[PDB]
Amino acid sequence: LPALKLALEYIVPCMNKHGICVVDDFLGKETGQQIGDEVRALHDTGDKITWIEGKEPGCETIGLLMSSMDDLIRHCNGKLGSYKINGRTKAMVACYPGNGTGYVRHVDNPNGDGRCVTCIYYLNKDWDAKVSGGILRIFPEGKAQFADIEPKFDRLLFFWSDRRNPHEVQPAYATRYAITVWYFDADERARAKVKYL
């Protein structure tokens, strides 16, 4: 699907209706394999998370992914709830070493630091939840039933960052790589800037 078709006909209505969106095969085997090579390079060369602006040497494919997310979000702007997106963080590359680690139930932005949307990219090739686990569970503002998201390769996930989506990362018994970008709300972020100082 083209960027604006994907955005308008899927991500926008889907975030409004559920607040959680998954897009599979986002960039294809070739681009995704390259992204994975770069991430595996970052970790297998040498703080289990690192921040990438996208123009660093060797992260050019990562910057490509960040740019693609940006394109989607540009097309969603003004249609994603009442938020106006005017910026985003750098990309956080995250590693779960595979020793039974995870992340306890948490909320990304519970103190109004400006982040509304969370964007995760999964680079895990031939990943079996049964054997390796590492599933992300989102409990969408209650909603009676949670959502289990496998970190399947070339998968792009969006969800609201505020209290609406509490989520946990179930223990990982294989090495788990992902890339996360957060998108800001203009007004919330401007109020946050003043409070921090």
Ligand X SMILES: COc1ccc2cc(-c3cnc(C(=O)NCC(=O)O)c(O)c3)ccc2c1
Residues that bind ligand X (CB under 6 A): 49, 94, 103, 108, 120, 136, 151, 167, 169, 178
Residue with Cβ nearer ligand X (167 or 189): 167
C-alpha 59: how far from its chain's center?
Answer: 17
Beta carbons within 8 Å of 175's beta carbon, 6+ residues apart: 95, 96, 97, 98
106 is in an annotated binding site: yes
If one counts every other C-beta atom within 10 angstroms of the C-beta of residue 18, the result is: 16
Among 38, 80, 95, 108, binds Mn ion (CB under 5 A): 108
The span from the CA of 62 to the CA of 77, in Å, is 23
Q: How far is the CB of 149 from ligand X (least distance, A)?
A: 7
Residue with Cβ nearer ligand X (83 or 182): 182
Residue with Cβ nearer ligand X (61 or 118): 118
108 is in an annotated binding site: yes
Q: What is the DSSP track for 56-87?
A: STT-HHHHHHHHHHHHHHHHHTTTSTT--EEE
167 is in an annotated binding site: yes
Task: Choose the stretch contacting Mn ion; rule: CB under 5 A; options: 30-38, 73-81, 101-109, 122-130.
Answer: 101-109
Nearest-10 Cα torsion for 12, 17, 19, 22:
-60
Q: How far is the CB of 92 from ligand X (least distance, A)?
A: 6
Binding-site residue numbers are: 106, 108, 167, 176
- Please report, as ranges, the residues that interact with Mn ion according to CB under 5 A: 108
Binding-site residue numbers for 2-oxoglutarate are: 176
